[PDB]
Design a protein around this ligand. Structure first.
Ligand SMILES: Cc1cc2nc3c(=O)[nH]c(=O)nc-3n(C[C@H](O)[C@H](O)[C@H](O)COP(=O)(O)O)c2cc1C
Ligand code: SF4
Ligand code: SF4
Ligand code: SF4
Ligand code: SF4
Ligand code: SF4
Ligand code: FES
Ligand code: FES
Lengths: 59, 229, 431, 212, 33, 117
């Protein structure tokens, strides 16, 4: 390994928290957004129905 | 607008329709699962979703039963735990003893949830079944033995891949999801099935034996192999 | 009736003459029976009073479910939603202890056909789908012939014997699918989908075959129904105990001098038909220790509780026994029981497909455990562990095949535990 | 029968040609007429019977052929041919004996019927005879439990057979067509000879049904 | 004697004979997968 | 029981016991061990470069316990001081040789001890 500090890792309760740390400490940083998956409507029968062209097949 | 249903104690403005799964997963509580998948389709096989409603005479399938007002869902309640124990005792009643040689065995979901649930000791006394290997492609080795009749892979395959070579075969004991005939499965998204396999049934050949998950760093970015970005 | 007296039953109380094949199963024989009676007039273009006639009939599920068929059929008073509605008839007759639906089709298709017409009308059904076994080929042809006789007479087909209500039956067959004995498995069989039953966030009433709404009923209920709609259903309601209104076929079977099927008042004492219709078991009734109510599915009955139980299923529930289409398999004491129940659970393992894991694995496992038991190699405590397995099978399995898969050995534990230990000691003594 | 996969490709049916008779096309089309136009698939199960009815056995060529017929992916036909046992994926003899040994018949000592069939034939139960005719096999409850052990030979229901009666059946199999009743002891139409109680009155007139 | 003693082909033929008696099947809607 | 020099060891058949399960890599408290599991031409999982340095080994003897296939063994030998540091940084090779010289002995001690574990 070259850089000693390379294995560092740090949890934070919030984003502004981490930004505040990098500001306190003087290092430059790059903020990134949270990625909660968007909700998906689902239903057991939605698989079926002749008209909806979901159908699936044998089960 | 939204129907009210109670997570254990808290009232919840849950969406009309929608499964108990998404209900518990709104407060953040997370139901144990296998065959179900978040962007696939519900299937009643492998009922790890079992939970009892507050007035339920007997346990419901949380991944499937639509929510409705007046229900309350004690996920932490004992009977649900007895249910999950009921699942895990059975999945392991005949599973192969090959965690160590499993490429998924360093990170299999069956393991984490084997830790979360199911009695620590087993009570097998006979002879487990073991299916023969069933090649379906140069770049997607399939050990089988390991696949838990969970059918997430056919619902992926038959659908989004568009190819239907994969599927169920037989009934009763020694039933198997091994695809009919020698012919290889092929698709332009053939490899993604590897990810979707809960166990080591669908280990990729090129990456086989190469590594173990914990050791790896996970540096992130984007590919440029497609313009899809 | 209302009194403890039972075993009585008038022949003309029976809805089913030509039960044994005499007096012509041919449509001319149905006419000799005057079966088409007021069948055209029943079709007054409005369910309700016939549906209420069945609600007042006191009639319940003849599929062994025992579920109130009047309420079950009440469900499709609903608007058709623009998707055609169908009635599916359960004729699987793959279930053990059950030869009841066999001879009736062999000797009285017609009352059933009138039942398809009346009950199909009650559903507002576009058609009248009917399953047949692949084991049942020749019989499917017999029924196809009688149905053709129904076509030529115009009694079915367009308008169907007047009234103007269009009505086409559709005979259907399977192949080795005992699980299609379960209704939704059969509904799945109709699409060409494999007969592995649906989980039901929506009921079959809500969504049926091809996505178009449907309904189902056992052959007995739907066949009795037109006569319920003609002869007073209250008259049907008079027999037996009130919740157990009507009559039921009693398939006495196994070790007995004269095994037979006898439709009879719901609440006769179980020993009576053995001492009557069955002619008594060989070596006398005293030999009996184990005889099972239900279609080789419900838990075993010891002779002590057996003397008291009435054939109606509620008495069985107090005996901790389900209806099980009231099939009766006698088992003489001289034979070992554990081999029999093990053979039964083996029968389940061969037939449980295996969609949801708990029942597949549960039977695949419990079978092998039974092999260890019957071989006598097993430790005495092990049986109790089997009980635990049963507890994880019951309310967890998506379908009731696992329930009947679990119960008989539960009874074998609960009563024959000392017998089990006694068997194990003998294997212990060999060394 | 663990070979569900059909990974094997025997020369007996790799790409061996096979075709339905035109009458069969008319029949399966009639079946299409039996079922709603939006889903040919309802017809899948019956065609496989007919495909076997022509043969008594189903070559893979029959499978992908039928898949061509209803215009549905072959895997459907594979899964359905496979899930349902009555279809025969191994070629058989002229007869397909499938004696029950299920408990209602087991108490009735159906197993003795089995040793009788073996001692007569010398077949190891399930194995095809060199004679290419008999194919004995044990089978689960056929649902004629009320009577006795039964031997449904190619949908020819037989009951109350004694081992000597089995001698009669097997010898008659080489002798000509067999009568196909219920009990063979002397009883018929399931009726007990010991009393014939139950229904007793012949008429059943169209009466009593007035309700109003 | 027997109620049944049929040819192997019999069922689909008896089925076909009554095809004229059949009311037309629904087209449902979507048809081509 | 005594702990000492490490040695990889074979099946009675003469195949190496190692399957590269790489949990013994997850346990070595000083993390002396390094493993690159790769497929055999025969297809079996096999380490291509198992190695350990006695410089960082703390002889806790975890790995003797941890291995599912009972591959690596903390052998009897103890006397092996070297003239140079390099002779300490063992390859899989040297460990195999160590399993070669002592296999009679090692298997013998395991024959004495195995019930306790
Ligand atoms: C011939 C026959 C076989 C059946 N087999 C099964 C079975 O194996 N498992 C099961 O859960 N239910 C079985 N059922 C019951 C069905 O689940 C369904 O509820 C029943 O057929 C409907 O009864 P009903 O018509 O009296 O309402 C069977 C019913 C019939 C008529
Ligand atoms: S799959 Fe998960 S559990 Fe089964 S072996 Fe591989 S790792 Fe162990
Ligand atoms: S791959 Fe094997 S295990 Fe993963 S889902 Fe498909 S079947 Fe179940
Ligand atoms: S539970 Fe077991 S038996 Fe009942 S349907 Fe699901 S799989 Fe078939
Ligand atoms: S001992 Fe052999 S198998 Fe166990 S981890 Fe170290 S190398 Fe892999
Ligand atoms: S000897 Fe002790 S320290 Fe060195 S590897 Fe084996 S366990 Fe880890
Ligand atoms: S979570 Fe998909 S069924 Fe249990
Ligand atoms: S019990 Fe064997 S066929 Fe009915």
């Amino acid at each position: 390994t070259a850089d000693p500090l390379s294995n560092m890792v740090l949890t934070f309760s919030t984003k502004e928290d981490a930004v505040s740390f990098a500001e306190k400490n003087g290092w430059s940083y790059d903020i990134e957004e949270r990625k909660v998956p968007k909700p998906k409507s689902k239903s057991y029968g939605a698989n079926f129905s002749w008209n909806k062209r979901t159908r699936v097949s044998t089960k | 607008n939204l129907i009210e249903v109670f997570v254990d104690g808290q009232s919840v403005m849950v969406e009309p329709g929608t499964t108990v799964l998404q209900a518990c997963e709104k407060v953040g509580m997370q139901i144990p699962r296998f065959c179900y998948h978040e962007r696939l389709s519900v299937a009643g096989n492998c009922r790890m979703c079992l939970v009892e409603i507050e007035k339920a005479p007997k346990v419901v399938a949380a991944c499937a039963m639509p929510v409705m007002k007046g229900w309350n869902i004690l996920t932490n309640s004992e009977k649900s735990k007895k249910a999950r124990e009921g699942v895990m005792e059975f999945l392991l009643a005949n599973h192969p003893l090959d965690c160590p040689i499993c490429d998924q065995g360093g990170e299999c979901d069956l393991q984490d949830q084997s830790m979360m649930f199911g009695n620590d000791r087993s009570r097998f006394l006979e002879g487990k079944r073991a299916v023969e290997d069933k090649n379906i492609g140069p770049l997607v080795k399939t050990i089988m033995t390991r696949c838990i009749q969970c059918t997430r892979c056919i619902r992926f395959a038959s659908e989004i891949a568009g190819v239907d070579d994969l599927g169920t075969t037989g009934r009763g004991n020694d039933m198997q999801v091994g695809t009919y005939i020698e012919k290889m499965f092929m698709s332009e998204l053939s490899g993604n099935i590897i990810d979707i396999c809960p166990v080591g049934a669908l280990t990729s050949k090129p990456y086989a034996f190469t590594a173990r998950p914990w050791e790896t760093r996970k540096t992130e970015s984007i590919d440029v192999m497609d313009a899809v970005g | 009736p209302k009194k403890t007296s039972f075993g009585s039953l008038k022949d003309e109380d029976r809805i089913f003459t030509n039960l044994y094949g005499r007096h012509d199963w041919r449509l001319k024989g149905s006419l000799s029976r005057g079966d088409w009676y007021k069948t055209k007039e029943i079709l007054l273009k409005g369910p309700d009073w016939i549906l209420g006639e069945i609600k007042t009939s006191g009639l319940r599920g003849r599929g062994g479910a025992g579920f109130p068929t009047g309420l079950k059929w009440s469900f499709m008073n609903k608007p058709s939603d623009g998707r055609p509605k169908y009635l599916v008839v359960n004729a699987d007759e793959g279930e053990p202890g059950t030869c009841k639906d066999r001879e009736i089709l062999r000797h009285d298709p017609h009352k059933l056909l009138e039942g398809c017409l009346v009950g199909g009308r009650a559903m507002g059904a576009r058609a009248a789908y009917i399953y047949i076994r692949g084991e049942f080929y020749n019989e499917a042809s017999n029924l196809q012939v009688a149905i053709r006789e129904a076509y030529e007479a115009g009694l079915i087909g367009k308008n169907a014997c007047g009234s103007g209500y269009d009505f086409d039956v559709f005979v259907v067959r399977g192949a080795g699918a005992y699980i299609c004995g379960e209704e939704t498995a059969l509904i799945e069989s109709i699409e060409g989908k494999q007969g592995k039953p649906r989980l039901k966030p929506p009921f079959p009433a809500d969504v049926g075959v091809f996505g178009c709404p449907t309904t189902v009923a056992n052959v007995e209920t739907v066949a009795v129904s037109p006569t319920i709609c003609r002869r007073g259903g209250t008259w049907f309601a008079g027999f037996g105990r009130e919740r157990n209104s009507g009559t039921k076929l009693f398939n006495i079977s196994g070790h007995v001098n004269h095994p037979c099927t006898v439709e009879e008042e719901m609440s006769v004492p179980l020993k009576e038909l053995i001492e009557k219709h069955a002619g008594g078991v060989t070596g006398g009734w005293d030999n009996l220790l184990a005889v099972i109510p239900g279609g080789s599915s419900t838990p075993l009955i010891p002779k002590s509780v057996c003397e008291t139980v009435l054939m109606d299923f509620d008495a069985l529930v107090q005996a901790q026994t389900g209806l099980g289409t009231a099939a009766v398999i006698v088992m003489d004491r001289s034979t070992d029981i554990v081999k029999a129940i093990a053979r039964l659970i083996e029968f389940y393992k061969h037939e449980s497909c295996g969609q949801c894991t708990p029942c597949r694995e549960g039977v695949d496992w419990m079978n092998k455990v039974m092999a260890r038991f019957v071989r006598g190699d097993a430790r005495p405590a092990e049986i109790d562990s089997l009980w635990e397995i049963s507890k994880q099978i019951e309310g967890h399995t998506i379908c009731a095949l696992g329930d009947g898969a679990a119960w008989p050995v539960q009874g074998l534990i609960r009563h024959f535990r000392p017998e089990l230990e006694e068997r194990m000691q003998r294997f212990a003594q060999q060394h | 029968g663990a070979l569900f996969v059909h990974r094997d490709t025997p020369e007996n049916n790799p790409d061996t040609p096979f075709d339905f008779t035109p009458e069969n096309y008319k029949r399966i089309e009639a079946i299409v007429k039996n079922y709603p136009e939006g889903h040919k698939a309802a017809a899948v199960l019956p065609v496989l019977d007919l495909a076997q009815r022509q043969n008594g056995w189903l070559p893979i060529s029959a499978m992908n052929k039928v898949a061509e017929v209803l215009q549905v992916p072959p895997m459907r036909v594979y899964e359905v041919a496979t899930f349902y046992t009555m279809y025969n994926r191994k070629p058989v003899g002229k007869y397909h004996i499938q004696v029950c040994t299920t408990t209602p018949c087991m108490l009735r000592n159906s197993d003795s019927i089995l040793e009788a069939i073996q001692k007569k034939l010398g077949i190891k139960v399930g194995e095809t005879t060199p004679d290419k005719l008999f194919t004995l096999i044990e089978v689960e409850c056929l649902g004629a439990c009320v009577n006795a052990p039964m031997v449904q030979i190619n949908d020819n229901y037989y009951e109350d057979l004694t081992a000597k009666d089995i001698e009669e059946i097997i010898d008659e199999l080489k002798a000509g067509k067999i009568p196909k009743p219920g009990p063979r002891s002397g009883r018929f139409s399931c009726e007990p000879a010991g009393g014939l109680t139950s229904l007793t009155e012949p008429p059943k007139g169209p009466g009593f049904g007035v309700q109003a | 004697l027997q109620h049944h003693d049929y040819s192997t082909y019999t069922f689909l033929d008896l089925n076909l004979e009554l095809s004229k008696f059949r009311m037309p099947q629904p087209s449902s809607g979507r048809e081509s997968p | 029981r005594f702990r000492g020099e490490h040695a990889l060891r074979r099946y009675p058949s003469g195949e190496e016991r190692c399957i590269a399960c790489k949990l013994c890599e997850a346990i070595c408290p000083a993390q002396a061990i390094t493993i690159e599991a790769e497929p055999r031409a025969d297809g079996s999982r096999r380490t291509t470069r198992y190695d350990i340095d006695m410089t960082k080994c703390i002889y806790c003897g975890f790995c003797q316990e941890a291995c599912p296939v009972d591959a690596i063994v903390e052998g009897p030998n103890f006397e092996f001081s070297t003239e140079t540091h390099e002779e300490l940084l063992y390859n899989k090779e040297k460990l195999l040789n160590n399993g070669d010289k002592w296999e009679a002995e090692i298997a013998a001690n395991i024959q004495a001890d195995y019930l306790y574990r």
